[PDB]
Amino acid sequence: VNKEALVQVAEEVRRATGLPVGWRDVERTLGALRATRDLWEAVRLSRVPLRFLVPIWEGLARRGLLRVEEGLDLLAEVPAPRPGEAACPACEGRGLVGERLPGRAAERFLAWAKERPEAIQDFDQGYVTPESTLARVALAWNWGDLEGKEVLVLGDDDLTGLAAALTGLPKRVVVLDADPRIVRFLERAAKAEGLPLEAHVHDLREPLPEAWVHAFHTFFTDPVEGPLGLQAFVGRGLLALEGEGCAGYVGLTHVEASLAKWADFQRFLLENGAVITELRDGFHVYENWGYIEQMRAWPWLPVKRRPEKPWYTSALIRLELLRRADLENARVEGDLQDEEATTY
Amino acid sequence: VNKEALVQVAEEVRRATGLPVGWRDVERTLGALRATRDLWEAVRLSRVPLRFLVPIWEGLARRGLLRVEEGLDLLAEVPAPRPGEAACPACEGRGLVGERLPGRAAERFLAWAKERPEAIQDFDQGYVTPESTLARVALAWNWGDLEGKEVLVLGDDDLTGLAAALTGLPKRVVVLDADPRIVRFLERAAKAEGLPLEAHVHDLREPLPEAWVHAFHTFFTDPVEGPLGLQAFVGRGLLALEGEGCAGYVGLTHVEASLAKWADFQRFLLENGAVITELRDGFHVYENWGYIEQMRAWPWLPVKRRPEKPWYTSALIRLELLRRADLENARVEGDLQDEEATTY
Ligand SMILES: CSC[C@H]1O[C@@H](n2cnc3c(N)ncnc32)[C@H](O)[C@@H]1O
Ligand SMILES: CSC[C@H]1O[C@@H](n2cnc3c(N)ncnc32)[C@H](O)[C@@H]1O
Ligand SMILES: NCCCCN(CCCN)CCCN
Numbered sequence: 001v002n003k004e005a006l007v008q009v010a011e012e013v014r015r016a017t018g019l020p021v022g023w024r025d026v027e028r029t030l031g032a033l034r035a036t037r038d039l040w041e042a043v044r045l046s047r048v049p050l051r052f053l054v055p056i057w058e059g060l061a062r063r064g065l066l067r068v069e070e071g072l073d074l075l076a077e078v079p080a081p082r083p084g085e086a087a088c089p090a091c092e093g094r095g096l097v098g099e100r101l102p103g104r105a106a107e108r109f110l111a112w113a114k115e116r117p118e119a120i121q122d123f124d125q126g127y128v129t130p131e132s133t134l135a136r137v138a139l140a141w142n143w144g145d146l147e148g149k150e151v152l153v154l155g156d157d158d159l160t161g162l163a164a165a166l167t168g169l170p171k172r173v174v175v176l177d178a179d180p181r182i183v184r185f186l187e188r189a190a191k192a193e194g195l196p197l198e199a200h201v202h203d204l205r206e207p208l209p210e211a212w213v214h215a216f217h218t219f220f221t222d223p224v225e226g227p228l229g230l231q232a233f234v235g236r237g238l239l240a241l242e243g244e245g246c247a248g249y250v251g252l253t254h255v256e257a258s259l260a261k262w263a264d265f266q267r268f269l270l271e272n273g274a275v276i277t278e279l280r281d282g283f284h285v286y287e288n289w290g291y292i293e294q295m296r297a298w299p300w301l302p303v304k305r306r307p308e309k310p311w312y313t314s315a316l317i318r319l320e321l322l323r324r325a326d327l328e329n330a331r332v333e334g335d336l337q338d339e340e341a342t343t344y
Numbered sequence: 345v346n347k348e349a350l351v352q353v354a355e356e357v358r359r360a361t362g363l364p365v366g367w368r369d370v371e372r373t374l375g376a377l378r379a380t381r382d383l384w385e386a387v388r389l390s391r392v393p394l395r396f397l398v399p400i401w402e403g404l405a406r407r408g409l410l411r412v413e414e415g416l417d418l419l420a421e422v423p424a425p426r427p428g429e430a431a432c433p434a435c436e437g438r439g440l441v442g443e444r445l446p447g448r449a450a451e452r453f454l455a456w457a458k459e460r461p462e463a464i465q466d467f468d469q470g471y472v473t474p475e476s477t478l479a480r481v482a483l484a485w486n487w488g489d490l491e492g493k494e495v496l497v498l499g500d501d502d503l504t505g506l507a508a509a510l511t512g513l514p515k516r517v518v519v520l521d522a523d524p525r526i527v528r529f530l531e532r533a534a535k536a537e538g539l540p541l542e543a544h545v546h547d548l549r550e551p552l553p554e555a556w557v558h559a560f561h562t563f564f565t566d567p568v569e570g571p572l573g574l575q576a577f578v579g580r581g582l583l584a585l586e587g588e589g590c591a592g593y594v595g596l597t598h599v600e601a602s603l604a605k606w607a608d609f610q611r612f613l614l615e616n617g618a619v620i621t622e623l624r625d626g627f628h629v630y631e632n633w634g635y636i637e638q639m640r641a642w643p644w645l646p647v648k649r650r651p652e653k654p655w656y657t658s659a660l661i662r663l664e665l666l667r668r669a670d671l672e673n674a675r676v677e678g679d680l681q682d683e684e685a686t687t688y
């Protein structure tokens with residue numbers, strides 16, 4: 001198995017789908033399989049979109065490189081680097097530990113997390129682990145984006161708004177979500193804990209209400225990752241920032257976003273006056289959601305077994321505005337999911 | 345003290361110097377001072393360029409907000425967040441540890457580092473801690489950028505090329521440096537250890553020899569941070585990579601690079617075919633260099649005492665190419681340092 005075979009597998013997928021599939025996607029796919037036979041683990045190790053993985057794995061099996069039977073088994077030696085093992089086990093490779101947050105936020109958060117609303121398919125939900133939420137807020141603490149600040153959270157199954165308000169740092173936290181269950185849980189917690197936290201039912205496909213335009217110092221979001229979803233979550237966030245010196249925090253996966261789309265998103269940030277100051281890949285680990293067998297890619301999977309441990313992860317990005325972002329505050333029409341999206 | 349005051353201080357410096365100093369850099373300056381009275385620690389905690397810190401501190405002192413004596417003490421209550429304290433102590437906030445590197449690389453590297461060339465002012469040198477070098481290489485291991493790859497290191501006081509070769513993963517490592525001491529040390533270690541590591545004296549202001557153009561899969565550099573220096577080091581890096589799927593690792597400070605410059609660099613990268621896949625801020629810690637009293641900023645400092653612990657830090661950026669970068673291979677003419685540079 002030589003280099004050209006990786007190139008040819010990628011070109012085949014490219015020809016069949018119109019998607020930006022490269023030879024290095026194939027390399028990554030093979031690399032992961034040097035370390036595991038389990039499909040979900042292969043996804044986690046690969047750093048390739050699940051939309052790409054399926055036809056790549058098919059192409060590799062058509063060439064006799066891969067056996068697809070109860071597992072994914074490499075049948076040949078391959079020109080692909082094996083996954084490294086250098087993640088710091090103390091912080092799960094984050095660099096940040098949420099346990100250190102003020103106000104005993106970590107212990108108080110874990111109590112509330114035990115009663116959180118289940119992730120539902122109606123809103124593409126799937127929350128990160130409590131440690132992930134707390135570390136996300138710890139990053140914001142470290143960069144000075146919580147204390148005395150006005151914080152907006154756009155979608156909050158992760159309960160970032162709650163963790164942030166439990167630290168005792170923000171001036172106030174406002175959460176928007178389409179799901180009344182999330183809104184109500186946050187309002188309940190806000191009342192019981194005496195927090196300056198408010199939550200509102202709002203669908204981000206509609207314009208942002210004028211009270212929230214250029215009114216915040218800091219936003220958090222873990223958005224739907226089609227370009228329209230990026231616009232509706234991250235563009236609203238940028239519109240919500242007062243301007244220069246304000247910060248945003250964004251969750252971004254490989255599972256549903258190609259490196260080509262990573263670049264497009266980075267261009268979108270730079271052209272709207274932002275700059276990236278942190279990008280910690282694999283920072284968030286997601287809890288398995290109940291609706292996995294009803295998601296888009298399920299029927300395509302070569303092995304179909306419910307996952308028993310976490311597999312879906314995302315990066316944390318920190319951005320800062322160098323000037324006010326003057327984005328159109330229009331309705332977003334059309335699908336927030338794109339062709340790369342597979343777990344909705 | 346109100347937010348308007350922070351804006352005023354910033355505008356004064358901006359007007360006096362022509363540099364892009366904003367209110368948030370003042371806020372960051374003040375926040376650091378809430379946490380420490382030590383100048384070097386204030387620089388570390390600020391995430392602001394030293395070029396900006398000097399005139400911000402002086403402006404704060406003229407306003408009766410800062411006392412400068414044997415330390416730096418705030419004289420009023422200020423609207424600035426304290427930097428948080430959530431970095432993982434096990435990995436020094438990096439999320440990666442060099443210890444599990446293959447080949448006994450960590451232990452072997454530490455032996456060699458005991459005999460390394462000391463940093464000299466003639467080449468603006470200052471090496472990272474041995475664990476920083478090893479962590480950098482471990483990030484590359486984790487991303488599949490070592491095993492069987494062709495590795496170029498552009499500037500190597502950090503000895504990244506030696507650490508990478510010690511893993512036994514690369515197919516070969518080539519190092520370029522203008523300092524013959526660095527080159528000779530690497531040649532010496534390569535022969536002693538029998539590694540596929542070579543080094544060459546090369547001034548990166550001159551064109552890259554053809555043999556190294558589009559020849560490599562991975563590059564590492566920790567560059568001079570004026571725009572010309574970024575062209576001489578990172579641009580040559582980009583030109584050295586074969587193309588799509590090849591990676592680069594770049595060190596980038598706040599101490600000598602403003603966020604306006606960070607954005608211009610990120611633009612430069614996206615426009616020439618790259619995408620950022622990691623940006624771990626504060627990843628590298630630098631050892632203190634012997635010529636600190638002879639560096640540009642020393643006479644300006646409001647308090648002058650030699651540092652006793654590390655203070656100068658940089659981010660580690662991983663980029664990947666989405667396509668070949670066809671940059672010009674011309675002479676770089678002019679100063680690699682710019683007005684934001686202060687440690688040369
Ligand atoms: C995308 S999943 C993250 C969060 O976004 C919320 N969400 C999903 N779609 C939308 C939408 N169109 N507008 C607002 N919130 C949404 C979810 O209910 C969840 O809490
Ligand atoms: C900038 S310090 C990092 C490394 O770059 C090297 N260096 C500095 N200037 C040049 C240059 N013009 N060409 C090549 N290497 C350089 C130094 O010797 C050091 O090892
Ligand atoms: N469909 C379930 C898995 C996708 C979850 N997405 C929303 C997560 C919200 N916490 C991932 C978003 C990645 N940006």
Ligand SMILES: NCCCCN(CCCN)CCCN
Pocket residue numbers: 468469470471472501502566567568569595596597633658687688
């Ligand atoms: N001049 C004192 C220290 C300079 C550090 N610069 C060179 C470091 C090389 N290991 C910083 C480079 C930052 N990109």
Ligand SMILES: [Fe+3]
Pocket residue numbers: 088089090091092093094095096432433434435436437438439440
């Ligand atoms: Fe750690």
